Design a protein around this ligand. Structure first.
Ligand SMILES: CC(=O)N[C@H]1[C@@H](OP(=O)(O)OP(=O)(O)OC[C@H]2O[C@@H](n3ccc(=O)[nH]c3=O)[C@H](O)[C@@H]2O)O[C@H](CO)[C@H](O)[C@@H]1O
Ligand SMILES: [Ca+2]
Ligand SMILES: [Mn+2]
Lengths: 272, 123
C-alpha cells in the first residue's frame, strides 16, 4: 500500500452537530470497531504521514467527553490520520491548569508512539466540517476558528484558543506551553505570543470550513478568571524561556486505557 | 446580556476620544475585559468587578459586601449589571479622568496593535 491521498476521498463536508440525543460509549465503540484499546487508529487503506496525538485538558467533563468521542472518532478516521486520543485528567481540587495539562499530554503521548503532530483540544469543541483537518501544517494551525459561541466568527486575529495543532518541532521551538497560568484565561494568548516570537504565523482554514460548535456550559469553580493573566501575557518573551517543557514537573497517579481513549490522571501541583 | 462589538461601539460614543482613547481601543479593551457581557461579575481578591467595564467595588461603586467603599462613582454596583450603559460610561469616565486607562489591565498587552480589526462598519 501507498501514501494516503493529500485530500481524503471520504470527507462529507458539512455536518449536523447536536447535543440532544444521549450518547452510549458502548454504542460508539460498536460503531468504531477499528479503534484499538487506548483510542488508537491507523489507516489500513494507505500510509498516513500524520501521526497525531490529540490532547484534551480534563477535569469533571465526562458528559462532554462522550459527545466529543461520539463525533470525533468518525471524523478523524475519515481524515485518514494515524491518531491517538489522550485525556489528561487533573487530580485534586486546586485551580485548573489547562496549558500545564497540555504539556503533560505532549510528554506522555510520546511514551506510546512516535507522534509528529499534536492537536490540543478543549473537551467541548466539535468541528462542523470534516474538511477542517485535525493534523499539522507548515505553520502552527488554529482549528476552532468560527465557534457558534462567538457567533461563528474569530473573536480577534490573535486568538488561539479552543482547538489548535502544532507539529513536534513547532511545539519544541517554543519550549512548549506555559505552566504558570492558573485558573481561566490568557494561556492561549501567551502561546500565541511564543509562536510569534519564534517567527511563526498562524495558519487557519477559512471561516466556513472552520465552523465548530461548543457545548453550552457554565463556568467551573476552581477555574475562575486568573487575575494575573494580563500581566503575565505582557512578559511572555522573557518567561517562555524558563516556563515550559523545560520546567514541567508532575506526578502520574493513574493511566487508564479504555477502548476509545487513554485517560492519564496527574497531580500537577498548585499555584506557586 | 452578551453584546456584539458593534452594539458596544454604538453605545459608547460619548467616551470616544475621551482621555485619548478611541472607539477601536475600547472595543478591544471591553472584549478582553468582559467579553462584552453587561452582566459579567468577576471577583479579584477580596473585591468584585461589575459589568461591561468591570468596574470594581473597591473604590468605584457601592456593593452590599462592601458598603463602606469610597463609591467614587456614586452608584450601586447593581446598576452596572443591566443593559443601560449611560451610568456605566459615566463611571468609566471618572475612572479615566482619575486613574487613567491603566485601570483596564488588558489595554497594554491586548490593545497596542492590530487595532483596525476592532472597527464597527455597521451604521
Ligand atoms: C472554545 C473556547 O472558547 N476555548 C477557550 C476558552 O474556553 P472556555 O471559556 O469555554 O472555558 P472552559 O470552561 O471550557 O475551559 C476550557 C477547557 O478546559 C477543560 N476544563 C476546564 C475546567 C474544568 O473544570 N474542567 C475541564 O476539563 C475543558 O477541556 C474545557 O473545554 O477559554 C479558555 C481560557 O482559559 C481556553 O483558552 C479555551 O481553549
Ligand atoms: Ca447600567
Ligand atoms: Mn468551553
Amino acid at each position: 500500500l501507498t501514501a494516503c491521498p493529500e485530500e481524503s476521498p471520504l470527507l462529507v463536508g458539512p455536518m449536523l452537530i447536536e447535543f440532544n440525543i444521549p450518547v452510549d460509549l458502548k454504542l460508539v465503540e460498536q460503531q468504531n470497531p477499528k479503534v484499538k484499546l487506548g483510542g488508537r487508529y491507523t489507516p489500513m487503506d494507505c500510509i498516513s504521514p500524520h501521526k497525531v496525538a490529540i490532547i484534551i485538558p480534563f477535569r469533571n467533563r465526562q458528559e462532554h467527553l462522550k459527545y466529543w468521542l461520539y463525533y470525533l472518532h468518525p471524523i478523524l478516521q475519515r481524515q485518514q490520520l494515524d491518531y491517538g486520543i489522550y485525556v489528561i485528567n487533573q487530580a485534586g481540587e486546586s485551580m485548573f491548569n489547562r496549558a500545564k495539562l497540555l504539556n503533560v499530554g505532549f510528554k506522555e503521548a510520546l511514551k506510546d508512539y512516535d507522534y509528529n503532530c499534536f492537536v490540543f483540544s478543549d473537551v467541548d469543541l466539535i468541528p462542523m466540517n470534516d474538511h477542517n483537518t485535525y493534523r499539522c501544517f507548515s505553520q502552527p494551525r488554529h482549528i476552532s476558528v468560527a465557534m457558534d459561541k462567538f457567533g461563528f466568527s474569530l473573536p480577534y486575529v490573535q486568538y488561539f484558543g479552543g482547538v489548535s495543532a502544532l507539529s513536534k518541532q513547532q511545539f519544541l521551538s517554543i519550549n512548549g506551553f506555559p505552566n504558570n497560568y492558573w485558573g481561566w484565561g490568557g494561556e492561549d494568548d501567551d502561546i500565541y505570543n511564543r509562536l510569534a516570537f519564534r517567527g511563526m504565523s498562524v495558519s487557519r482554514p477559512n471561516a466556513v470550513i472552520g465552523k465548530c460548535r461548543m457545548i453550552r456550559h457554565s463556568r467551573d469553580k476552581k477555574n475562575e478568571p486568573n487575575p494575573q493573566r494580563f500581566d503575565r501575557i505582557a512578559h511572555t518573551k522573557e518567561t517562555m524561556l524558563s516556563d515550559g517543557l523545560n520546567s514541567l514537573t508532575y506526578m502520574v497517579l493513574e493511566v487508564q486505557r479504555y477502548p476509545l481513549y487513554t485517560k492519564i490522571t496527574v497531580d500537577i501541583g498548585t499555584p506557586s | 446580556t452578551e453584546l456584539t462589538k458593534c452594539k458596544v461601539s454604538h453605545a459608547i460614543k460619548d467616551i470616544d476620544g475621551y482621555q485619548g482613547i478611541s472607539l477601536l481601543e475600547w472595543a478591544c479593551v471591553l472584549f478582553h475585559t468582559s467579553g462584552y457581557d453587561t452582566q459579567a461579575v468577576v471577583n479579584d481578591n477580596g473585591s468584585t468587578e461589575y459589568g461591561l467595564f468591570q468596574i470594581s467595588d473597591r473604590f468605584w461603586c457601592k456593593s452590599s459586601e462592601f458598603p463602606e467603599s469610597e463609591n467614587i462613582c456614586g452608584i450601586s454596583c447593581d446598576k452596572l449589571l443591566d443593559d443601560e450603559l449611560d451610568d456605566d460610561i459615566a463611571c468609566a469616565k471618572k475612572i479615566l479622568a482619575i486613574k487613567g486607562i491603566d485601570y483596564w489591565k488588558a489595554y497594554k498587552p491586548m490593545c497596542s496593535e492590530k487595532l483596525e480589526q476592532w472597527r464597527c462598519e455597521k451604521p
